[model samples]
Target chain A: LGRNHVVLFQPQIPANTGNIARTCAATNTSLHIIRPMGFPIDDKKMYWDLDVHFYDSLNDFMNICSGKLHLITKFANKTYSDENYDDSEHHYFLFGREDKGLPEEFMRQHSEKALRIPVNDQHVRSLNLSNTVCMIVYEALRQQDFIGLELSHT
Target chain B: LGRNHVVLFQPQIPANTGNIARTCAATNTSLHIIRPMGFPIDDKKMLDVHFYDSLNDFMNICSGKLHLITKFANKTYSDENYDDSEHHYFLFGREDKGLPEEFMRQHSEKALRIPVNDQHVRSLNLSNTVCMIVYEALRQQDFIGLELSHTYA
Candidate 1:
């Protein structure tokens, strides 16, 4: 049951959430979505069968956030690849809304936990939410040598 | 001036293509589309799309290394070293059937795939797949030519 978790906070777009859910299932990673999500959890496109967890609030999810917690943001000094993710630990990655990122005050408190994916901010405001999350997930999976995932000839 | 490309072999969805175009813009990667596409090559929703007459034509013209992504490949995407010195193309197949099986057989040496949890999922969305593959290429390149700093505050 130990796996990397992608937690979306107040996600506003159903398409992005649905896409992220698809990726979660494919990676064997659990998904955590804080309350006030953009879409309902029952949407068929969201792939309801994955190991998904819901949180009433940020603190609610934080209460049980086991192992490491990294808040993904543009302002972070640390790039995602700089962090080492051991497959042995259950990790949680919290992603903010499509427009605004995670709660500003919270990120300040956990600035050390903030990690940024190297992106050309000038070209586009932000990479697609699903795309951003997948980058982080795969980087961790890559570091882990894709241990629990299908390797060749799926 | 730069060298990285994302080529789609007969992509079927508009939204996925649009999403990919967005990613391409973000990373400074070029976008190429092969013919017999499911949607129009030019439309209001598109950003910047380059077309290829056929996969062969695309292969012959582009001097960069070509990597065909599929689930059956022996090599994983992360294992392959995508050199940034020259151009590289991350080619993907149609969403439903994937690159032509015969074609894959012919190009087995160049085939690569993103690792996925087979028991729980069949395949990833085309757009997401493209992003993962393209970013890996950039990652290996050490993010050359990309603005690595926080630009707009």
Candidate 2:
């Protein structure tokens, strides 16, 4: 019921980047990391190692979402959400760095469409970066009934 | 309808332990690690230099459950409805090192059951441990709509 959803952000931690990228890769979603990122987006040491950490593993994940990374222009025709949403089929994910949320101009630029998870007073900050993305991605996928399905490994 | 559930196991790759532990932490489930794990469950460098080792993070993972580690002999009676359990109970085995035969035998006599999947294959993956148990425990939890009694601070 939609085009591929995308994950875009400026500066991102590798673990956050890795987890989100891995989640997107696993679910067939597109990942878009805006350059001028604060951290090296591809730092292996900064990522959660799943096993023996060899150079091969680093290269493996770097290649995980290779070529899928996109760079948006400084002055594009439209904001992330407004650019090209197809009413009949649309899925959009626009995110800014956790530390440096989208600049005021960007928020002002896409005020109405930008979204954030609702939280109780207990949670001083918002959700964890990767956690937030996973929640949103899964929710979107959940709403769509997760089509293109073939995952019964019983 | 009862209390929260835990998916405990003794695993090798600290990474799978690390990742799955994170999953359990995120989902509000308890993760137990049997001793003599494949790797030093505390070694952070081996886990993820970026992220704290699962062992360390686990320390902060919803404390108050009386995190435990017991021997197979401790089991009193095997609650076999392994296929059809109604309570929020779960059991997990380590990767590579399947539960010792003696442990299984001892556990077989316990009130809390020792469930098994189709052993068509010899064993299951480490990361999938929590997924398998938590799902069933969650089913029972959902069946009665019980919420996590406490929150992690």
Candidate 3:
């Protein structure tokens, strides 16, 4: 189910932590991010370093980890075609940068991005980064079949 | 695809951290645990208040609250026989209580219990306790055939 995932914007808001990483860890997806993030990349107190890492830059990160991570760079460019749609082998999730979404530059580069969850007229545009991340990732996980198997004993 | 689920007996291990709870939460199914659970139920940091209370106080918390919560004593005996397996909702997950073979005899009088998941092992995690039930529950929910998609600014 985790054969696909996203690369979060490099710099992110701090509070939206743990759950996303834990979600990725639990779901078996790779997480990608650009550098110079908002919070300390190595915060030990929050245990952020437990199972996370970054790259020198987006390009380096993109080129090196794309195969294993199954990241999709040009969100706007690809339509996740029908063949790709029915197939459960792979699914990619992309998240906008914190506060500011994917820059116009990135969007212009990758146009066919993933769908978004709508917000109400109350002016709320999006959910927290981690919440959105978990929601979307879990959706992908859910669709392939809620095979989220957990072993139990009698 | 979320209707089918499994029940667990008196669980002891805590470090497993109940991976199934997280599984059930994501899948969206009704998870029931028979009372008198082993261990303090609060010993693990994860189980302390936030996790356990999440289920206990579920009615008030999330928008996607569980569909139902029922007690073993309240259910009809399995012999009562009901129609509509499609809507067959109430699945009971019991902790590793040492009711043994004799316990089945008493339950047989009024409640016709059904065995759900047959685990290779003897015991399961408390978190896992609720998970398998939800996984099976997905079977019913799956029939609903609803997939939501929305656009944002």
Candidate 4:
């Protein structure tokens, strides 16, 4: 596991995927999308720019053993920061659809691997999927000294 | 400062603003918008939920805690110990173009930026930038009083 991976399960929004694609491109991270996408790839503006690797099913992607699995969910007991990510180890950050998060069964099965970003419970439903990806990926990057990234503007 | 503030200067995208508003609402942070908006406020989805217009008014409320979020900043966002203060404002530029050079120059010392590989992309999305900084500050504060476990669980 050399680079970070952002995995989306049945993402519903094109903009979120587009934004995350730009981020993945910039960060040198790989993006994996499980099938039944909300928007057509050709219609999305970022489709041409991003080379998305599609998977027939989540099991197919997970079975590949790309790296350590870290499921992102609102119901997780463990905060994202609780686990210390090794720079040398590959990381697979999994997220659910915008409308409904990861299947409860999956989260329950992988409860120990599930991670969460803390948010105000009453006022907002959740952070945008793209933003969530950015926050988690950047945190991992920050830990890795932003490998192969520019630190300041010249 | 007792709260965190997110300021968007000349934001032109409604979807970005809507997304940021939702994040602000979730983080219990206040949302600030400067004039010359790209979309009409009434038409945008997150108008009444929790938005503050006019940088001047927002500054009047937060005064000295403003921090400009720009690419030219010397300090990385994670470098700051956000919980040291009770109130803090994280300001970001427009979606099309970042904050004006002169404005950033004036507030150079107070400027902060999220580190990104500009070689591949010009900058992170406006809403994503806010989310990154806001979460950093919240993380520093130990996610104070925010629910960690799912309420439904």
The candidate that achieves the highest DockQ relative to the unseen native structure: 1
Q: Deviation in angstroms for B13 in model 1?
A: 0.8
lDDT of each: 0.82, 0.42, 0.40, 0.79
Model 4: clashing residue pairs? B1-B86, B1-B87, B2-B86, B2-B87
TM-score of 1: 0.91
Worst 10-residue lDDT window for candidate 1 chain A reads A39-48
Query: Taking the tens digit of each residue's C-alpha lDDT, what string does model 1 give over B41-109?
Result: 575554345788898888778886889989889988889987657678888999887998788999899
Error of 2 at A79 (Å): 23
Q: Which DockQ value does candidate 2 get?
A: 0.04
Rank candidates, lDDT, best first.
1, 4, 2, 3
TM-score of chain B of each: 0.87, 0.53, 0.37, 0.82
Model 3: chain B TM-score relative to the native chain B: 0.37
Of 2 and 4, which scores higher on TM-score? Answer: 4
- Going through the candidates in order, their DockQ values are 0.66, 0.04, 0.05, 0.66
**Model 2, residue A70: C-alpha shift (Å):** 18
Candidate 4 residue-wise lDDT, B1-153, digit = tens: 266778788889888888888887787776777787888878444322334566556566665477888886889888887877456888888887888777777779998877766666868888988999888888888886254324312
Model 1, C-alpha of A123: deviation from truth (Å): 2.3
lDDT (10s digit) by residue, model 1, range A1-154: 4568899999999888878888888887788989988766564443346778888999999888888898899879988887999657877899999888888899888999999877776568678899888878999999888874753232
Task: State in Å the error of residue B67, model 4.
Answer: 1.3
